[PDB]
Design a protein around this ligand. Structure first.
Ligand code: A1BYX
Ligand code: ZN
Lengths: 1119, 55, 353
């Protein structure tokens, strides 16, 4: 087996969000838990400033902030799915950020049955203890003191077993806990006092009280009100011993309330969210009782507006609320004083992409660009969507002037009054051409005082309203307004300029080994410094940074012999840090630049290597040497902002944008074959565009959003289920299901317009293959009826061309696009099942063959089957399908019909169907993997092997005829090999705790492809897209050693060792990780410091640190 | 153990032995109320009363 | 774990955990063996024979003796013993001792349990809304499925599909079939634990030896509940084991006169186990002899031997009331050891999971 698995897209679904002061006592923070990731932000008037993002070795189950005695800022408590408790402290020392572990420990019991309502963790107001509820009838308490480092906690025997929700009650003498529990009698609210000394539950403040049969939420009300609020389906009650206030408003019965958050510290207002995606305001009215303390007057509920389906909510400040969603896009909303015409105080501000739940997906090379694209069935209910994900950063080309051999580009402004650029100077071999930009027109013009028979190295707008031009012959200065040469510096011995660089106010040129520092002043260029170097100059840069914003105090340079990057002071040339470089290749380019706040020195070489180091603007010394290869030809480094952030463009064989995110440099490729030179441009006809140039053509065009992976969202406003592509018709087939309420008039009416209703063409599945007398339709008013549908969405515009609705109670479960038999037409075949609420098992279903012709989906064939069709696949020109526990193979006859060719009756339900050649891997929801094979001479199926281990299963895929990848219970991945003697059983050869629930596997890759065997992408419920590629044993054996060596040096968050986290876990079985390599762990080898690499790479084949750099870099190219 | 059958006894379940007077039954067990004893006639094995058969 | 546990020779039953094994031993060699099992508090084994002629077994259950009743009579010291199955096992070796009693080398099979299918999808979503108390049955089941399986839409399968694998829904589906036969409440009679519920159903279902062997081979309680429903829904006909095409009774005629399930374990005065199933009607059976009341398992009702119409094999007995005040007036007590659950039409035995 031996498989390698890496994350192509991090999980996007939000499962927890809190507000506090984690970074600083003054900074209001927002922490977000994206499953195995933690995001840290700061609340500002604009929005959220990203500060840090860390990789947690576990699914974050609980996330809470607290500040005990003798603590300047909030500490973060986090508990993972594998019960790993931790107290994390934020510590920023200068421009470097670090998350350190104050205390850590595993709180998993020896023997315990996990509770039905998951894990519930809560903290006491005075930060005296942490109350966890991991198992049924057992309430664990961690003693919060400045001494418990290992987190040794005690378990208490709780008589109540079925506890729904529990919160530490505010305003109490001792640490009290309020909770709602269920028993055979009914749901009730109870209180207990938690004593650390005695370790037992003493009587609480008030007696046990009865609550609604559908009451399932507890809110710890802070001072001065106190007590708790119990939310249910119809009633909302308050409990403070003596007082029992209750209201049943009609505005809340439409949907179940699922989340809550506090707005005021006192607790006068609370935001509530429901399943239908509504936002409400729960107002605790306060009566002014003259005895100091106040009493609750009445509870009032108000509808604010419509938001995404929120798992958790959080009020930030000034009406700004963050909406953390699991189903749809997480969003940032604003609550206004005055509501809009529709009557909604909620107004969206920003939308954060969420690809999950990825229920289905396919790989299609949509633009035939060589690189594949991924279209996914994302979201559910009103949050239904289709997302197209592709690697790289696009370039929207507008101009295309054929000018071969350009050796430099520079934007210019001939007129000072205009802020926009109207000139673009191009350099050529021994010559310089100048172009004019009158809108979209480009004409060859001559700028005064600019020599044209010499090759230019730099030119542009400079201080005192002047223009500069550094040529092989000499440096020129032209007065912008009268257009004339005013000053010209020449070399004393009439020598040519070898290398040169200039900025807004300074000019630094070099002739072989000589160097001359010049300054820009009205009509003059005066030489200040004159220094000779050890060897000939290779490259130069003088980009100023945010030290003083005027003239740069430091300068970067490179040498021909004894290659090294050096930093120099301008009024003297003092050698600050001489970082020596290795190899027999000279640095072609060098650049100083700012990124977020920290400054960096980037140095490129002829072999395509790029070094980057942190550089302090006052001291002038380098730090953290990190090397990375991008291309094979020399790289050119230029700067551009585009969307309010400085970015660097690296022109080479593999052009790439070096940008920053999470205070570290990111290297995302641009979708262009080759760029030799480029510059940013901002003309009237080309606003905020980029001027790229290659071996043959000058091109002007707008860049895409600067980020790894470009995602396009198509909203449907209904749940998508399956997707397949039909190349002949240039469109996708998508199964969908809107929810229509049962009308009193005897019909259906949607809650909102969606893709299936708002379509160009629509049709109903008028058919009588199912008789009317099957099951009596006894659904009352307001019942949720699921109206299934098939959409013919276009592949270029993604517009819904057709929406064929199925029959009443019909459920579409499978869909394929293929040519069957000797028929040249490609069809859309759908497997359905008749689901009547009264019937438990589906005894009816059908298979419909469709043909999208003349803009209308025609029905070709309709085969009724006695059972549900869960999966179908194309098998050697014959349609293979699954009816309940029967794997049937159909033949497409000349009279366009599906005749039954062969049958195979199995003692397991057929949910999954995958094929490779003549092999058929069937599967079940209870991990019943079964490999069958169709012998053509026999004319029927034959079992080869099986492995029926009882375990939940979500997806399956065939890597090759022997290896079979699959996803199983408690977020794990497994592989089944075939030993083709004993052949009738599959050998399990892979175990790996992924931490994500895989809904779908799909063969393909998102790389251009102009090292590893095979390529399988996977879509998870948390919006994470992963990749599995199989590898050799020699390569596995090497990378397995790297896994053990990297764990010794990488400082894990919460000190959780990698071996335990990625090891298999299904409660009863907890085996180590085998037959799998965590690619994300391997990829972090480049992120560690240079001395750490020497410790990792400690010990024919020799270890060498640089050798393993190329192997790890090769593995990053597969995703 | 010879033991000859003297009166016809029809079996009421799969545990009792269907008998016809004349045959000798090899006595396997000889303990029970009303002389109910276990026996085998080569193939079939089952119980029978003493007031029907004789030693 | 591994244990060399002893095996009784007279046992011919396929015992299921929780099911009671009645016994009546005449031989003093097995009586003394039973009494040693009392003092040492050890458990004996019940080998589920595939080929009972040459004594061949691959699986079984460890039975613990829970009752002993020495009845020192004039003839011989006759003993009556009740035992209960506890743990399922795999047979590794059959060590036949010089005393004619075999000591099977046993490997205890683990009781495989699985959590809620929705808990494996997400951790904190829809946790508060999961278990609910106790308006009509239709409205409770429609909202229970929509509220418990709300996470199902996040996966590649519908709500109703996961209902076919949920232990609570499968148990309730079985309870609806059981209530049609027996007029008893689940409250205390039937257990709430899916493991105990599955084994309780397995013991009281009228099924042949091979179905019980395959049912005992099942490890997960979820799979066992699904297989039990497949038998109830597909095998709606019971036929003679000898001639396999003689329809005797159907599912819709099963009832419980005794308030101890539809098919209970009874024993005749000769020490033989008869798992009698009570049915209102039973076609294709010949009645032999006169109606007797000697050692009547159902007092008041008179039994008459009921043999097959074709092969004349003993199938059961016809029970008719003597007093007119009784209700019902007639029923048939059919023995499990002679009934083959046949799927009607022309399809052979098949059962998903
Ligand atoms: C004497 C000694 C034994 C038997 C006898 C033998 C085998 C089976 C049965 C069954 C019949 C049905 C019933 O109700 N009870 C039974 O025990 C009986 Cl009675 C009858 C008389
Ligand atoms: Zn018969």
């Amino acid at each position: 087996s031996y498989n390698y698995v890496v994350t192509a897209q991090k999980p996007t679904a939000v499962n927890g969000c809190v507000t506090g002061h984690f970074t600083s006592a003054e900074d209001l923070n927002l922490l977000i838990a994206k499953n195995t990731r933690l995001e840290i932000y700061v609340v500002t008037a604009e929005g959220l400033r990203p500060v840090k993002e860390v990789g947690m070795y576990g699914k974050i189950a609980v996330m809470e902030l607290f500040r005990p005695k003798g603590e300047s800022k909030d500490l973060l408590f986090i508990l993972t799915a594998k019960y790993n408790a931790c107290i994390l402290e934020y510590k920023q020392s200068g421009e470097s950020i670090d998350i350190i572990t104050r205390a850590h420990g595993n709180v998993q019991d020896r023997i315990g049955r996990p509770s039905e309502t998951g894990i519930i963790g809560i903290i006491d107001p005075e930060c005296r203890m942490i109350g966890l509820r991991l198992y049924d009838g057992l309430f664990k308490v961690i003693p919060l003191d400045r001494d418990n480092k290992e987190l040794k906690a005690f378990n208490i025997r709780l008589e109540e077993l079925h506890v729904i929700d529990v919160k530490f009650l505010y305003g109490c003498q001792a640490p009290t806990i309020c909770f709602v529990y269920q028993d055979p009698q009914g749901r009730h609210v109870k209180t207990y006092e938690v004593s650390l000394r005695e370790k037992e539950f003493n009587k609480g403040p008030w007696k046990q009280e009865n609550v609604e049969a559908e009451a399932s939420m507890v809110i710890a009300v802070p001072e001065p009100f106190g007590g708790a609020i119990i939310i249910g389906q119809e009633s909302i009650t308050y409990h403070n011993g003596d007082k029992y206030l209750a209201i049943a408003p009609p505005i809340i019965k439409q949907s179940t309330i699922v989340c809550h958050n506090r707005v005021d510290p006192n607790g006068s207002r609370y935001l509530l969210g429901d399943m239908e995606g509504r936002l409400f305001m729960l107002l605790l009215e306060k009566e002014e009782q003259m005895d100091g303390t106040v009493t609750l007057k009445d509870l009032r509920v108000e509808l604010l507006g419509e938001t995404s389906i929120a798992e958790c909510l959080t009020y930030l400040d000034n009406g700004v609320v963050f909406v953390g969603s699991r189903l749809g896009d997480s969003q940032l909303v604003k609550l206004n004083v005055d509501s809009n015409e529709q009557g909604s105080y909620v107004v969206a501000m920003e939308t954060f992409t969420n690809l999950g739940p990825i229920v289905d997906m396919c790989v299609v090379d949509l633009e035939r660009q060589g690189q594949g694209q991924l279209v996914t069935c994302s979201g559910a209910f009103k949050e239904g969507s289709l997302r197209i994900i592709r690697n790289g950063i696009g370039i929207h080309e507008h101009a295309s002037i054929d000018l071969p051999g350009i050796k430099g580009l520079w934007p210019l402004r001939s007129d000072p009054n205009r802020e926009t650029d109207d000139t673009l100077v191009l350099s050529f071999v021994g010559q310089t051409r100048v172009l004019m930009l009158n809108g979209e027109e480009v004409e060859e013009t001559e700028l005064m005082g600019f020599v044209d028979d010499q090759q230019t190295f730099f030119c542009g707008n400079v201080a005192h309203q002047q223009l500069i031009q550094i040529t092989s012959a000499s440096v020129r200065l032209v007065s912008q307004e009268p257009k004339a040469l005013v000053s010209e510096w020449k070399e004393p011995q009439a020598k040519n300029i070898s290398v040169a660089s200039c900025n807004s106010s300074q000019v630094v040129v070099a002739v072989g080994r000589a160097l001359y520092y010049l300054q820009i002043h009205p009509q003059e260029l005066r030489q200040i410094s004159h220094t000779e170097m050890e060897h000939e100059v290779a490259c130069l840069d003088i980009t100023p940074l945010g030290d003083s914003n005027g003239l740069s105090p430091l300068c970067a340079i490179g040498l021909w012999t004894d290659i090294s990057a050096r930093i120099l002071k301008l009024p003297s040339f003092e050698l600050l840090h001489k970082e020596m470089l290795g190899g027999e290749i000279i640095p072609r380019s060098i650049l100083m630049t700012t990124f977020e706040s920290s400054h960096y020195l980037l140095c490129a070489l002829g072999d395509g290597a790029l070094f980057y180091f942190g550089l302090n603007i006052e001291t002038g010394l380098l730090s953290d040497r990190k090397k990375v290869t991008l291309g094979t030809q020399p790289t050119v480094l230029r700067t551009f902002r585009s969307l309010s952030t400085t970015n660097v463009f690296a022109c080479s064989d593999r052009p790439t944008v070096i940008y920053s995110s999470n205070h570290k440099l990111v290297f995302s490729n641009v979708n262009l074959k080759e760029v030799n030179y480029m510059c940013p441009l901002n003309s009237d006809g080309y606003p905020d565009s980029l001027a790229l140039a290659n071996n043959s053509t000058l091109t002007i065009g707008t860049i895409d959003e600067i980020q790894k992976l470009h995602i396009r969202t198509v909203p449907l406003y209904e749940s998508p289920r399956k997707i397949c592509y039909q190349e002949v018709s240039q469109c996708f087939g998508v199964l969908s299901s809107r929810i229509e309420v049962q009308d009193t008039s005897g019909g259906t009416t949607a809650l909102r317009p969606s893709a299936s209703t708002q379509a160009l063409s629509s049709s109903v599945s008028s058919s009588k293959l199912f008789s009317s007398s099957t099951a009596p339709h006894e659904t009352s008013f307001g019942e949720e009826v699921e109206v299934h549908n098939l959409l013919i969405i276009d592949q270029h515009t993604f517009e819904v061309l057709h929406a064929h609705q199925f029959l009443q109670n019909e459920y579409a479960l499978s869909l394929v696009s293929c040519k069957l038999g000797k028929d040249p037409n490609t069809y859309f075949i759908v497997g359905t099942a008749m689901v009547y609420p009264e019937e438990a098992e589906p005894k009816q279903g059908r298979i419909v063959v469709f043909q999208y012709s003349d803009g209308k989906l025609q029905t070709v064939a309709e085969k009724e089957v006695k059972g549900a069709v869960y999966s179908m696949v194309e098998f050697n020109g014959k349609l293979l399908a699954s009816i309940n526990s029967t794997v049937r193979l159909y033949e497409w006859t000349t009279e366009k019909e599906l005749r039954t060719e062969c049958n195979h009756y199995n003692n397991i339900m057929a949910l999954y169907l995958k094929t490779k050649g003549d092999f058929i891997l069937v599967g079940d929801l209870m991990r019943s993997v079964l490999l069958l094979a169709y012998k053509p001479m026999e004319g029927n199926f034959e079992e080869i092997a099986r492995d029926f281990n009882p375990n939940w299963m979500s997806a399956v895929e065939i890597l090759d005829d022997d290896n079979f990848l699959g996803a199983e219970n408690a977020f794990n991945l497994f592989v089944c090999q075939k030993d083709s003697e004993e052949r009738q059983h599959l050998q399990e050869v892979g175990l790996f705790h992924l931490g994500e629930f895989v809904n779908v596997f799909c063969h393909g890759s998102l790389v251009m492809q102009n090292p590893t065997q095979g390529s399988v992408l996977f879509g998870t419920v948390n919006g994470m897209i992963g990749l599995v590629t199989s590898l050799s044993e020699s390569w596995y054996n090497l990378l397995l050693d790297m896994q053990n060596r990297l764990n010794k040096v990488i400082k894990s968050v919460g000190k959780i060792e990698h071996s335990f986290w990625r090891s298999f876990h299904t409660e009863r079985k907890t085996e180590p990780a085998t037959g799998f390599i965590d690619g994300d762990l391997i990829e972090s080898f480049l992120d560690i410091s240079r001395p750490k690499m020497q410790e990792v790479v400690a010990n024919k084949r020799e270890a060498t640190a640089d050798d393993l750099i190329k192997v790890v870099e090769e593995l990053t190219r597969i995703h | 153990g010879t033991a000859k059958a003297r009166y016809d006894f029809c079996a009421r379940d799969r545990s009792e032995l269907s008998l016809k007077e004349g045959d000798i039954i090899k006595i396997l067990n000889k303990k029970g109320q009303q002389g109910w004893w276990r026996g085998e006639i080569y193939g079939r094995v089952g119980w029978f009363p003493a007031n029907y058969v004789e030693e | 774990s591994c244990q060399v546990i002893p095996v009784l020779p007279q046992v011919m039953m396929i015992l299921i955990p929780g099911q009671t094994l009645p016994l009546q031993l005449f031989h003093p060699q097995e009586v003394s063996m039973v009494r040693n099992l009392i003092q040492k508090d050890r458990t004996f084994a019940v080998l589920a024979y595939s080929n009972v002629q040459e004594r061949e077994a691959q699986f079984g259950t460890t039975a613990e003796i829970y009752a002993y009743r020495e009845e020192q009579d004039f003839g011989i010291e006759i003993v009556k013993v009740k035992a209960i199955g506890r743990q399922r096992f795999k047979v590794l070796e059959l060590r036949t001792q010089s005393d004619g009693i075999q000591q099977a080398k046993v490997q205890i099979l683990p009781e495989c349990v699985l959590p809620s299918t929705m808990s494996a999808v997400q951790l904190e979503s829809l946790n508060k809304c999961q278990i609910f108390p106790s308006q009509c049955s239709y409205k409770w089941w429609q909202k229970y499925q929509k509220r418990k399986f709300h996470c199902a839409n996040l996966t590649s399968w519908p709500r109703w599909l996961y209902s076919l694998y949920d232990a609570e829904t499968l148990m309730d589906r079985i309870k609806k079939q059981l209530r049609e036969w027996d007029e008893n409440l689940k409250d205390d009679s039937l257990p709430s634990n899916p493991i105990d519920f599955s084994y309780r159903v397995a013991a009281c279902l009228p099924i042949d030896d091979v179905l019980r062997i395959q049912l005992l081979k099942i490890g997960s309680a979820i799979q066992r509940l699904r297989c039990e429903l497949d038998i109830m829904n597909k095998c709606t006909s019971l036929c003679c084991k000898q001639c396999q095409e003689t329809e005797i009774t159907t599912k819709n005629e099963i009832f419980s006169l005794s308030l101890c399930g539809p098919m209970a374990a009874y024993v005749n005065p000769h020490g033989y186990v008869h798992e009698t199933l009570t049915v209102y009607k039973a076609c294709n059976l010949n009645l032999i002899g006169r109606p007797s009341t000697e050692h009547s398992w159902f007092p008041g009702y008179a039994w008459t031997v009921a043999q097959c119409k074709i092969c004349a094999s003993h199938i059961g007995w016809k029970f008719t009331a003597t007093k007119k005040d009784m209700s019902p007036q007639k029923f048939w007590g059919l023995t499990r050891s002679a009934l083959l659950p046949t799927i009607p039409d022309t399809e052979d035995e098949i059962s998903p999971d």
